[PDB]
Point group: C5
Chain length 353, copies 5
Amino acid sequence: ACPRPAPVPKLLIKGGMEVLDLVTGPDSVTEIEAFLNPRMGQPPTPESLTEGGQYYGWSRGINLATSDTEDSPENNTLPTWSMAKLQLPMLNEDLTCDTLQMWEAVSVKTEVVGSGSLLDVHGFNKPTDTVNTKGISTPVEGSQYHVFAVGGEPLDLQGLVTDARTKYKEEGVVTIKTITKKDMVNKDQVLNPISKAKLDKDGMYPVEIWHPDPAKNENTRYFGNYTGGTTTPPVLQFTNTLTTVLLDENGVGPLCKGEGLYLSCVDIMGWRVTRNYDVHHWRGLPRYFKITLRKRWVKNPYPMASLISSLFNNMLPQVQGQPMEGENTQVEEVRVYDGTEPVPGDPDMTRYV
Amino acid sequence: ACPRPAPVPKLLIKGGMEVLDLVTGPDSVTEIEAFLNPRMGQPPTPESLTEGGQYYGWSRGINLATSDTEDSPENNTLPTWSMAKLQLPMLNEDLTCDTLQMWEAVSVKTEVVGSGSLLDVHGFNKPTDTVNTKGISTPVEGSQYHVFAVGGEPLDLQGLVTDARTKYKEEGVVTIKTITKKDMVNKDQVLNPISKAKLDKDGMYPVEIWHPDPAKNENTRYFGNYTGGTTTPPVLQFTNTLTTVLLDENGVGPLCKGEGLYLSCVDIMGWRVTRNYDVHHWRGLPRYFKITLRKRWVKNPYPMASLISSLFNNMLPQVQGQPMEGENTQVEEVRVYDGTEPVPGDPDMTRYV
Amino acid sequence: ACPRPAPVPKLLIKGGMEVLDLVTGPDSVTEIEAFLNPRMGQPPTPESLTEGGQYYGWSRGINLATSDTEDSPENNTLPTWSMAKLQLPMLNEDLTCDTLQMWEAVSVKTEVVGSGSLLDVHGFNKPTDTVNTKGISTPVEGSQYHVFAVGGEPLDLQGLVTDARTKYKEEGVVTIKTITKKDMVNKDQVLNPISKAKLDKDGMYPVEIWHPDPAKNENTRYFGNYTGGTTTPPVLQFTNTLTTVLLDENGVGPLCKGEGLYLSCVDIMGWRVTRNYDVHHWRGLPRYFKITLRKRWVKNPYPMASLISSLFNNMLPQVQGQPMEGENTQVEEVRVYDGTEPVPGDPDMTRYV
Amino acid sequence: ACPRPAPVPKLLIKGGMEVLDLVTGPDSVTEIEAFLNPRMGQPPTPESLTEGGQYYGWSRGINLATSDTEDSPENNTLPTWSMAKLQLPMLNEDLTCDTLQMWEAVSVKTEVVGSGSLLDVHGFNKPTDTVNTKGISTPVEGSQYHVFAVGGEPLDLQGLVTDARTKYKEEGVVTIKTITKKDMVNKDQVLNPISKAKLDKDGMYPVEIWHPDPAKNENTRYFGNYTGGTTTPPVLQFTNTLTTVLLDENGVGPLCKGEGLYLSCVDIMGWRVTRNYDVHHWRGLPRYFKITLRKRWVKNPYPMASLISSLFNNMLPQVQGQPMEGENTQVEEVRVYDGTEPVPGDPDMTRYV
Amino acid sequence: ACPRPAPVPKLLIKGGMEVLDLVTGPDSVTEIEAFLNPRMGQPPTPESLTEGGQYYGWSRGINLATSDTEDSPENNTLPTWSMAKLQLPMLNEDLTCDTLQMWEAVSVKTEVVGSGSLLDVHGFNKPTDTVNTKGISTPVEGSQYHVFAVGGEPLDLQGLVTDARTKYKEEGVVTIKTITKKDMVNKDQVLNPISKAKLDKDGMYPVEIWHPDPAKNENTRYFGNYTGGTTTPPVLQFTNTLTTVLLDENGVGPLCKGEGLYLSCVDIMGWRVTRNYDVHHWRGLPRYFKITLRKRWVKNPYPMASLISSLFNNMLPQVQGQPMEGENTQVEEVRVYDGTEPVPGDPDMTRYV
């Protein structure tokens, strides 16, 4: 006769990623909490706070062009994309009748951590009263750029730039020249459907060149917002409560291909103007992700018997041949016949213009 | 006994526009993804990045008037409308009993691509500390103007201007003088119901003269917003998820007349202040459209038998006659009798004032 | 067996106002599209663009006071209210048993036309770099004021002002002195319940004196917003889709008294700073209205037999008499007896304080 | 057979407050429209517009402190609260079985009247171009403070201040020293639960000292918003349509105690910078209230027989006695026994810490 | 036959915390109203308004760094977290069959008190016209930071900072060095999962170091928002009506562990620039909480019989042993067998990569 508490979801086990090595069942729900650190310029390797004052979390500087044509942005100056991949375990397969189980990111709680740290108004920055060098060491202000993305495959990026005459270093960074082995053209200033990439690496794709692709991303939900200016005050809101839903109009949400779950982010909060000159280090704050995923039965796309084709693709030679696909293709026409239609008149009659 | 995945819409075939040459059926749904590049000033033809530094994507300059009456805005300075037309295939006709099938833009996902590229703060622009020419090369700021429009027929535009004494070039651009062959009058500064146009051309209708017509556009859904100022920081938000619905209060949405689908856009993000003088090139970013359309049965409006009238309109001469329609019309009155009403008193009694 | 299209409202006839001369029925719905031009200062009569450069659409100037007491604002400087009245036809009357049919504004789509025209950044305005007189001719900025109102009777206005010592011209404009024949008092600086008016005229009621009356307007829905400042960037949004509903908590909406429908508006977008001095012409953009109205059966208020009273009011003389209504009224008390109540005690017992 | 109009609430009688002297019934609904004028500094008594230019509606000036300790804010400088009380009539009493009828503020439509009057940009204020004293006489800008409150009893206020060393005049204004007869302490700079008051007077409680009490107000719904700064452009929106609901989570809303209904407001719109020095008069606009109330049956709280206690409280002397309530109370303990509980163990066992 | 009023929740007793010593029942609801004062710099102990002018409620000053490496922020300069704990009474226990009753914060009404006090524009602050030292004593402006949190256990905090070379005092304040006994490293500039803390103390955790932990807080609902800049005008809104709900997706809300209820807050409203130099005291306003809680039956987690283990943990010695948990653990593997599975093949087959 004692009172019954209210039913809530039962927590089997908590811990680290090794917890996922437990075969739970078909109705289990996993909540993974991770975070991503801002990689904008200074790498995290020289750990000592004496090499430069430890700009980890900040950029190294900014040095304007010396003429119209001379632009060399010095990779440790460019804020870049942060990415991470959580490898989830394997699931069931039901090959006796085609189907397969795979993870499914159902929702996400994200939050930029460390807004209050910008209330550090001591320090050796440009003062608010420069005629006497007194007052307040101006806080972080300027252009802000907040993007995050949760997906089942790496973010597809598209290349846009300001003047395409910028000469980015050819090492330690990925630019449009690294992927399209030629130079950058004027069409890279607006939209070139050939300047595409993925977000495989981390800290190498600058955010001023590579933007999330609207056409491509299908297994990825990305949200973003940009706020320009020179003294635009930062604005942040954090909350323990409100959550984003990652489902789509069919009610699916990002299915984790392979088995990984890909998180991407960039959180640029403004600048910081030093004292001797007006050097303008960037600032970026980490982003906390909490992804709620479940297990969904899908249809196995690939005819795994095709591994014999792989066998037939291994023993058969690698052929050069003559171009039958692409630009100079030598295939005149291909027509597919399926049923029995009555004898037509003009056998090719379509859009009239 | 194996588990059944969840039903989703089945994807027949994907690819380019040639995919549309497949006779699908009455319940098929098409998703077309296109993009529009910003045409504001510099045309895309001189591809070399040496003619001027390749302002493709930017305007060429801005040169203020030399007196009150002297205004010659130099067509490669004026941002203009971008438009494109996707030609969809032909559909069924059911002329045995009047009706007809035609496409119907059901929804749209749009997104301005390339916001982060405005985080290029190196380069030879006006610095943030001009007394020493040091700091940051000021980013893009200023008046912004974001409009897009999805329709079944070209956007109808209306002409408004600042001072109507501006002398626009009479070549390569479409102004109020090109359409109303006379000059511009003072009523063109507020609203002239005769300064109307369509958006047939592309890159020729400047956005400072031709605004979307509120009275006319019936088969077109257009959304827009303007934000003035001189240093107004740009603001953009992009997202993979949220979508616009193009239906109206009857639940129809733009029916693609002819068979084309017309996309129009303009995305002005601000200015760019160079160093030698304060020349003020514009900036514009491309816009990605993804239109979801379906097939609707409508009523065939035109009595196609009227082609005989066309025959009767071809053999009969072209007559001059005396004005029977318009300004100097010579038709005194026209009355239409339909039924049998009782003998009235005063046979013309209407609004009393 | 052919497919049936979807039912939509049937369009009988379209055209101009003469279309309304067709006796439609009890379930017809009318959509009237009109526009209102901004009347702020310069009247539209001197059509030539040589009298001053044709400030139609703009104000003429602004000349600050010469001392604390000397204010003469020069009517062609003051932005004023725009109003228009569409005269709808007469409807049925059912006097055999008291009732009457009259129009009813059900909804409205409004839109300020001509936002992009403020992207005219050439021209002879104050430049953005005045130390060299170079850069951009500053665009329209400043205090903005957007009001519109759809009603069945003219807008009721209330008079407020800054210092009541301003001497407005006594011709061509309507001020608080024109309506309350005495001067302006200090109570006109906050709220005087006697400084009331209507919006009968057009272009004569300045918006800095006459504000929409909250107490009075019952058959009028007015919406407005003001945004002060000196360099506040303008902000506008236009859309083909979203519509306002003019119903009230009883579900009626403005019933067109008489038969007219009254539209009122004012759209002040900022200023324009010229070059020689800092003269500050205003700017205003036209507003497009599209009102959807229907026909409602109401109760005929007036006992039309009272026309005999009008007869009795015409033959009987015009009497001076002694004041029986108003300030010095000579009516001691009036009591109305209706039924049979029991003998009361103290026959006048009400709020005790 | 004639058509029936749609049912709406029937209007018995309209007019002034004397209308309320009509015994309507149990389902009648009253709509009272009033307004409140801004009382910020200059009182309304010297009506002539020659004493100072008639700052009615404005403050008189502002004179900064002469040292850290010397603050004397000169009552006609401080904006204060506006309040008014509408005395409603008496209602039924049903003392034969305890219950009582009283009014109940069900909803409210409020609106600040006179936004457009801030478009008075002539006049003798500080010009926008001070180096030549030309341009525009700067409009009203600055800190804004909009509060209103509808209740059944006067607003309860709480005292907060900036430096508690301010010496407010001891006449014509109500400060924390007037209510707590001692001086102001440092705890008055953050929150002192003893610096409480009501809003009985009008124009005497400055808004920089007395803020609406969150703990106390139970029969009062107050809404407010503050916007600081020095040149913050004002922003106002007025509308004929949208209304506030004054009910609470039980669906009651302010029951008018006694019989009065208390309206309170303050609407500070910014400053006004004069020319000779930078004197900074405030500006305030009136607020229009329209309260919709009804009649509710409640439970009569007081045992009106207690009037005999009042008799026993009148004939019995006024005793000094020894402190039995308060700070030095001499009541050791009070225990109330109600039923029959089993013999307990430790007879006082509560929160363990 | 007399009319029945509407049912509302019955108020048993009101007063202070001693009211909670009444054994109410299982369906009682408690509403506790408290407030938290801002602890930012100057402690409340030197009560006299002569030690410095009584900065209680403000910070003491701000003194910028003297070089890149020299930062000593002087604890009475740093705004810190405010926290309080309301100790609720004990509730029932039903140990005969495992379950237990405990409080549950169901909702909260919070409000920052004292916005209007920032309309104190006299006083000895930096004037608005410094070239003559005249005008208005500039009001509070700048970076603002509003956080509050209601929980059943103290807020878990995470350490982030600007340059980790800042030397905070090692007394009277809690920094990352006080909790991680070593120094601060570069990873403390972005995110170190080891720089965690709780909010046990009050006024000792500066808000520029300790931010609410997103990963940890489970029994705590925290809301916050930051707004940077140097002259960002403050913005506040207060209301008697609207309330926050503290439930979660299971409908539980913070269960008060132990028996306490923990409130935390920080409300930084900007700065204040004095006259002699540009010293920049902070400003903070108190926050009023009103928490509505109820009594919920939960499951008693701990096997209270484990007190014998405590006995066995008291008599058994304190062992040093060899590391079996942690970094250098000497436990090779642990496997748990539960049922009878068929003989497997490769007995360890998991995620393949």
